[PDB]
């Protein structure tokens, strides 16, 4: 026999994905997966969460905006990003405050109900609930990418903030292109599709290609290429700190062994504390514009010159020669150290606030991204077992093979609809 | 091309004198540092002394200092190393070798070239 | 007074095989040290200078590395030609040349 639809529920109408295999099947307006009256408790927590998450990023928007300057192009990619989640949040408010009016329509009364999930893009106030929460959510997730972008950029390339302002527009591009670019794509072969839960249209809901594809891909590419931006940053600044720390372990056996030169006697322990002040000296200008190690060069020199002036038997004027070195070394070398203590000033103030804000938003997210494949791996089955268990009020469909139980867990499309906005709210730690 | 080359070496008295030469050809004694490095028959190379004719800037080793002398002139463009109260473990070969000066690649380049080496022998 | 430990004092490898030297000093000399090969008989001949760099004459097959106070030279390939003395020495001062004890290279059988 095969697979069947029922007389019952049949668009005859602006045709899209076809439901369960079969063209112009449709499902319902009710869902009828947790029927009566847990749905509309559903309706009412995606409007009870919608208005914390807009309370937490609108409240950003006007927050940022008190000052709009002195946040640098290092701090500029979540100016942008809460922007984005702005709207997202915002969709889903639209959608509690409609109900059930636009995301399906009641159709005519020529069939039983007649109420069915608008497919495609041939009815309006739909599409467009698409165009602005999708495009803005894959913006989101881009903006957080060009944010581990700038925070590789400024922690491994060592670029400055201009030199990436100058860039700004090439991020835009991107940034407002790669969502714009995909959400072109999927008015062409209009794989936009309803909703029951919460009264917003998207795309991969009701599909195993357009969520794989076209929602689950995309995040998990940029989730991959932000952590591996990000774990590039935090292993190069990691390396930068440690010439910093060698550097200033030169520099206090040079301080030290002075100290200890400047208050001892004899011409014994002279020549093995010059021995150490060159070698720190070598090593600190091999550690390592042309100023600085020509100061070096000029530090190590009068080491030897202090070395040459000990090996003779003379211990004053050796004395002399080596408190000598403090003035070639305050002004050649000490203002490059206030330099590396005035702009490595901290990038820990911006590894913690990345470590932070990626910390809220990768979480949530990889709880999101780890109910699309818990849909992903089942919903072949569930709707299998839909078609079964209501086998008995319409004309009996697949008699065969309908040997199947696996009911969703309510527990866990209310968390995939959580951290949808749970990451939006991510952005309020940074302010 | 330049060349480093030693002579006066021979048979001598213990406790006697003895004057070694390391004639430069090519590159002035001025723009470089010349040393000399002794290697004992059946052991490893040990450091004697060095001199800079810029300045001048004579030193020895600690087994040798007071008892051995170094001296460098740009107009025969050589080296000179006397022998002063020679003993039995002083027998060995004498390289003479070349180091840059400070700063540059001439300081970090170690003895490039080094001369032929003359043996040197107690005649007890 | 800057001691040099070069404890293998004799290493054996085949022709065709891995040589490696490790050199220690007693202080921590900065990145000059000098690797040498003396053949039997001749003047010594520069092989690795500044514990990194590669002297211009010499094959590329030699090695010079630094991690700390340790130095190791190492010869990936063995050629007829590379049977001789090595001698490590640190170079931080004129009157501070310390050389170590030598290691000697023969043929494996």
């Known amino acids: 026999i095969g697979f069947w639809c029922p007389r019952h529920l049949k668009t005859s109408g602006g045709q899209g994905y076809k439901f369960l295999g079969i063209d112009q099947c449709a499902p319902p307006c009710p869902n009828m997966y947790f029927k009566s009256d847990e749905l509309e408790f559903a309706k009412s927590f995606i409007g009870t969460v919608s208005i914390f998450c807009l309370c937490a990023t609108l409240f950003t928007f006007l927050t940022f905006l008190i000052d709009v300057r002195r946040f640098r192009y290092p701090e500029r990619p979540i100016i942008y990003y809460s922007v984005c989640y702005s709207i997202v949040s915002l969709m889903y408010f639209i959608g509690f405050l409609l109900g059930d009016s636009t995301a399906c329509n009641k159709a005519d009364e020529k069939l039983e109900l007649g109420d069915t999930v608008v497919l495609g893009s041939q009815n309006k106030a739909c599409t467009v609930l698409f165009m602005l929460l999708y495009f803005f959510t894959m913006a989101g997730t881009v903006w957080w990418v060009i944010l581990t972008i700038t925070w590789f950029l400024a922690a491994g390339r060592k670029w400055s903030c201009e030199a990436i302002e100058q860039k700004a527009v090439w991020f835009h591009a991107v940034a407002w292109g790669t969502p714009g670019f995909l959400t072109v794509m999927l008015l062409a072969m209009n794989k936009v599709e309803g909703d029951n839960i919460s009264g917003v249209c998207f795309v991969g809901l009701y599909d195993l290609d357009a969520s794989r594809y076209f929602v689950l891909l995309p995040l998990c590419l940029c989730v991959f290429v932000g952590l591996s931006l990000l774990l590039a940053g935090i292993i190069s600044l990691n390396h930068a700190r440690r010439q910093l720390a060698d550097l200033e372990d030169n520099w206090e056996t040079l301080n030290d062994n002075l100290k200890v030169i400047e208050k001892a006697d004899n011409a014994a322990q002279v020549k093995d504390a010059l021995t150490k002040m060159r070698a720190a000296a070598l090593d600190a200008q091999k550690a390592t514009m042309k100023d600085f190690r020509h100061g070096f060069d000029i530090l190590v020199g009068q080491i030897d010159d202090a070395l040459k002036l000990a090996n003779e038997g003379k211990v004053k004027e050796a004395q002399a020669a080596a408190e000598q070195l403090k003035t070639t070394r305050n002004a050649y070398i000490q203002k490059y150290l206030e330099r590396a203590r005035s702009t490595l000033e901290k990038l820990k103030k911006f590894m913690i606030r990345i470590g932070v804000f990626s910390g809220l938003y990768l979480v949530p997210l990889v709880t999101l991204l780890g109910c699309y494949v818990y849909e992903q791996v089942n919903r072949i089955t569930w709707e299998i077992t839909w078609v079964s268990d209501h086998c008995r009020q319409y004309h009996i469909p697949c008699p065969y093979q309908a040997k199947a139980k696996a009911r969703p867990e309510l527990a866990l499309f209310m968390i995939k609809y959580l951290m949808t906005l749970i990451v939006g709210i991510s952005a309020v730690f940074w302010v | 091309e330049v060349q480093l080359v030693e002579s006066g070496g021979g048979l001598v008295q213990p406790g006697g004198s003895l004057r070694l030469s390391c004639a430069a050809s090519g590159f002035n004694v001025v723009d470089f540092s010349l040393h000399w490095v002794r290697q004992a028959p059946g052991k490893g190379l040990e450091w004697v002394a060095y001199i800079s004719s810029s300045s001048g800037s004579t030193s020895y080793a600690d087994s040798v200092k007071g008892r051995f002398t170094i001296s460098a002139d740009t107009s025969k463009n050589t080296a000179y190393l006397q022998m002063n109260s020679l003993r039995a473990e002083d027998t060995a070969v004498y390289y003479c070798?070349?180091?840059?000066?400070?700063?540059?690649?001439?300081?970090?380049?170690?003895?490039?070239?080094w001369g032929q080496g003359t043996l040197v022998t107690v005649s007890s | 007074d800057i001691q040099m430990t070069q404890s293998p004092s004799s290493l054996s490898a085949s022709v065709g095989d891995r040589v490696t030297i490790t050199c220690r000093a007693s202080?921590?000399?900065?990145?000059?040290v000098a690797w040498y090969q003396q053949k039997p008989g001749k003047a010594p001949k520069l092989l690795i200078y500044s514990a990194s760099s590669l002297y211009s004459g010499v094959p590329s097959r030699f090695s010079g590395s630094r991690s700390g106070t340790d130095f190791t030279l190492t010869i990936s390939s063995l050629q007829p030609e590379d049977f001789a003395t090595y001698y490590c020495?640190?170079?931080?001062?004129?009157?501070?040349?310390?050389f170590g004890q030598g290691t000697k290279v023969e043929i494996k059988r």
């Open positions: 020495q640190q170079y931080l001062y004129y009157s501070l040349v310390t």
């Open positions: 202080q921590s000399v900065s990145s000059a």
């Open positions: 070798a070349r180091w840059g000066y400070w700063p540059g690649e001439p300081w970090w380049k170690a003895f490039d070239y």
